[PDB]
């Protein structure tokens, strides 16, 4: 049942129907709908889109037009009055490690990606939005509210370009605007291998039939691999420090270098690939180039699904886990595996877990140097710190020894993300992730905070006194009401992230419902979900059940002290054990007796 939407850009295939290997583009996962789930297609819509002209112009684009009677408040003003805070003390999540926030980004990045329009790299359209803030076509700038400090320093606005959409590119098609997802909707470790056949192949070694991924040649990490640099010459990573000119990295996903801790996580993944392919070679000396690559890839793919569903969602969705994601019962071909547009905003709850600083610890898990604790804002698109100052061991240690930030109603997003975010295209370190997130809700057309509380079958507040109760907070409910003038207009992001947390989770009623459903779907609809009979052998599954991020850390770095539960907050040296005391990934059942 797959065809109409728009023939679209999407590159045509022919399915093998018998290949035990996933396609790079995600196509052919579903035999009835080939493309359901495949990259470079439209995000899924769980509810009708809500645009100003009900087709493609966002709410806030035309000043004089209201929403339900009132004027949507400037994203940046919501940011200033409700989001930001000053005191960075007593704001850490006592029972979550920095890895908690870090793994979430890996997952989100694996599942969705709505790139900006482009149609500019020569053009003066990439400057008529930066310099003058003139709204039009794909530039929907974030104006600055009266009395904003950035007015005196940065200008009258922050450039912002609407997301890409799915038939064309430039102008339009007749119908209702739908944003694009440039990656695959299946938890298949697509951030490691790319989503297009072309990128997928540039990432491979194809000189030696060992099936290895290509690693950097100009620099090493104690004999260990580094990701490969990037060929493209305008590079933001060179920019932040024109003196050490280190370019960004090249990996299956483009945001791989937004921040030092993300690239670090990426590097651990590239390694286990090669590692997993050197071993498999030993075992089966007759296996060839493609065989090694695919089989290794298949493994790492099952890895990510396991860590995520077993270790990561249970402490995110808390006690609301079994209500949305019941125990697995097999493949279901009647389930839309496609990521929905709202998931990409619901999942952004993490943004309020990013802490103000990042640390580097030596072996005794102590301060590594004199400038070991650096401000979060000096690490965006920073590769020199890795390559030219320490390696990745110091950074991985921090991920385990330090903590995550705890969403606090009186303290939402770090000022490191709200005032000093760096953007790949521009130069200053002065953007606001909060205003961008909010502006993007409207860009993508998301419906109000209530339409969603309704979608999830929750009470819908119409009065100040009512909003006080749901958020269980007066000040907040009042500020939220002074700006939005009706609970019907609270942007789902700031809206969803304002409800108090659920028992043992880290998100509330409306986010738990939105994340819950989604994850249930990608699992129930993936023909290659590791627990799905036939994908792996009964004996293979038994061996994968033991994987643990901890081990991943041991077989891939020179760390020898790691916690058993890398996600909860552990303290060194008590909660740390020696690597030799940690279960290994026994690849024995991956041997093949010809006779
Ligand atoms: C800096 C940034 C982060 C911290 C170092 C950070 C972190 C996260 C986490 C931990 C997420 C999930 C649990 C998460 C989700 C999504 N992000 Fe955020 N992210 C940083 C920076 C950015 C920037 C800049 C953007 C672009 C926003 C835009 O709309 O232009 C960004 C996006 C997202 C995003 C949207 C996915 C998409 O399809 O584009 C998440 C789902 N992150 N981030
Ligand atoms: C910090 O968070 C930790 C993770 O939630 C928590 O430890 C976990 O506590 C839960 C019970 O709340 C238990 O989790 C698992 O227990 C049963 C076995 O009896 C499993 O079959 C279930 O899947 C369930 O998830 C464990 O006791 C433990 N889990 C892990 C992985 O360590 C800590 O208690 C929290 N620390 C503080 C101070 O609150
Ligand atoms: C841009 O990246 C540079 C890395 O190439 C970085 O400079 C490097 O780091 C420090 C500079 O403070 C120097 O390291 C230390 O060397 C010895 C110890 O071995 C000390 O005696 C020195 O005082 C110094 O602290 C490196 O030598 C230096 N390398 C080079 C080529 O400059 C810059 O700090 C970065 N600049 C910015 C603005 O971020
Ligand atoms: C592709 O794989 C080959 C085979 O392992 C790599 O060749 C090795 O290169 C390193 C340093 O250049 C040395 O250990 C040897 O010269 C090679 N080893 C062997 C066993 O041949 C090659 O570097 C890889 N290419 C890329 C881009 O990653
Ligand atoms: C296969 O997955 C579908 C996807 O939802 C399941 O659909 C059931 O529940 C849906 C609402 O959540 C409803 O649309 C349907 O009434 C219902 N489907 C049927 C056939 O009753 C479906 O139950 C799953 N199939 C099996 C055998 O579990
Ligand atoms: Ca994916």
Q: What can be said about the biggest beta sheet?
A: 2 strands, antiparallel
- Radius of gyration computed on alpha carbons: 24 Å
CATH architecture: Orthogonal Bundle
What ligand molecules are bound, each kind once? protoporphyrin IX containing FE, a molecule of 3 linked components (NAG-NAG-MAN), a molecule of 2 linked components (NAG-NAG), a molecule of 2 linked components (NAG-NDG), calcium ion
Total individual domains = 1
CATH structural fold name: Myeloperoxidase, subunit C
**Spatial gap, N to C terminus:** 42 Å
Helical fraction: 25-40%
Major β-sheet strand ordering: 1-5
CATH superfamily: Haem peroxidase domain superfamily, animal type
The beta-strand count equals: 10
Structure class: mainly alpha
Q: How many distinct helices?
A: 21
CATH C-level category: Mainly Alpha
**What would you call the shape?**
globular
Features:
monomer; about 600 residues; Myeloperoxidase, subunit C; two-stranded antiparallel sheet; 21 helices; globular; binds protoporphyrin IX containing FE; binds a molecule of 3 linked components (NAG-NAG-MAN); binds a molecule of 2 linked components (NAG-NAG); binds a molecule of 2 linked components (NAG-NDG); oxidoreductase; Thiocyanate; Iodide; complex; monomeric
